[PDB]
Amino acid sequence: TQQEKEFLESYPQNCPPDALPGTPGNLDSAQEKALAELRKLLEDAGFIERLDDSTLLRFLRARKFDVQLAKEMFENCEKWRKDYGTDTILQDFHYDEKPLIAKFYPQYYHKTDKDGRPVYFEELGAVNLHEMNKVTSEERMLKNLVWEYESVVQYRLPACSRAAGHLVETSCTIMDLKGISISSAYSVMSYVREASYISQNYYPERMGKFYIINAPFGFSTAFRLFKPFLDPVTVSKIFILGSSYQKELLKQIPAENLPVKFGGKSEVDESKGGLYLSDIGPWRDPKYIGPEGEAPEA
Ligand SMILES: O=C(c1ccc(Cl)c([N+](=O)[O-])c1)N1CCN(c2ccccc2F)CC1
């Protein structure tokens, strides 16, 4: 379809050459063969959508380029999108509760990192589900999560790719644990479990960086101790920081892109809902919005 063709050639499709192997534009002979094989296998099953290089390579990387297991993971995902209504969630779901409950679990995207990734912030430590459940449900919070993911894929990543000069398939997540207790950790645990399950199985290879900040001492000490036994890919992606996280964040995010409260210089109009209701980034800049148009407002 022209439509889909126009969209694909409307932003850069190659990852930088120093990215991980098996990423778009960085494929060896074997990898290119696995991609072509997986594609025809999915075409033979009648799939017509989501068969672009970027998508299929993510499923291949998630299965170490085992073509057969990538096919099964892909087919599992399309079945979930069917049962959950994912393909129309942007039109069907309406998180009208958000101004009322945002402060009880702040979640927001704000600008980009030095690699061009959209930066996602989650103030898990402030979570108050007792107040949240007066207004909304875990089921609706997960719908809102998938809504945002669909908005990342459809509108934030293509804009971030154009603004960066190269393909951007991943986000940079900052999770603030300030205020977390054993009690509230248990209360958010079911939500976090379902969110990771959805991320790993239906959005594979979308995690580029994951910073935990204000981590309690026991949690941070454990990571510092087991850090040497981690996959070198993993140790470049996951950071568990305590109270002094600002300098580490500033190595990864330009100071003018990082919110003031986290050691940066980026400001929002605190009178108009400030950070918690904001969605600022290149996907709100006409310079970087392509034929998909501008992302909806939550
Ligand atoms: O894998 C992801 C992930 C999943 C989907 C999308 Cl579309 C993106 N993205 O590019 O914005 C990232 N994440 C890592 C785990 N994540 C997470 C998981 C559980 C609790 C909180 C969290 F922030 C969310 C982000």
From Swiss-Prot:
Protein name from the UniProt record: SEC14 cytosolic factor
Intracellular or extracellular location(s): Golgi apparatus membrane; Cytoplasm
Organism the protein comes from: Saccharomyces cerevisiae (strain ATCC 204508 / S288c)
Listed Gene3D superfamilies: CRAL-TRIO lipid binding domain (3.40.525.10), N-terminal domain of phosphatidylinositol transfer protein sec14p (1.10.8.20)
More details: Present with 84300 molecules/cell in log phase SD medium.
GO annotations of cellular component type: cytoplasm; cytosol; Golgi apparatus; Golgi membrane
UniProt superkingdom: Eukaryota
Keywords: Cytoplasm, Golgi apparatus, Isopeptide bond, Membrane, Phosphoprotein, Protein transport, Transport, Ubl conjugation
Glycyl lysine isopeptide (Lys-Gly) (interchain with G-Cter in ubiquitin) cross-link site: 40, 82
CDD domains listed in its UniProt record: SEC14
Alphabetical list of PANTHER family matching this protein: CRAL-TRIO DOMAIN-CONTAINING PROTEIN YKL091C-RELATED
Recorded GO MF terms: phosphatidylcholine transporter activity; phosphatidylinositol transfer activity
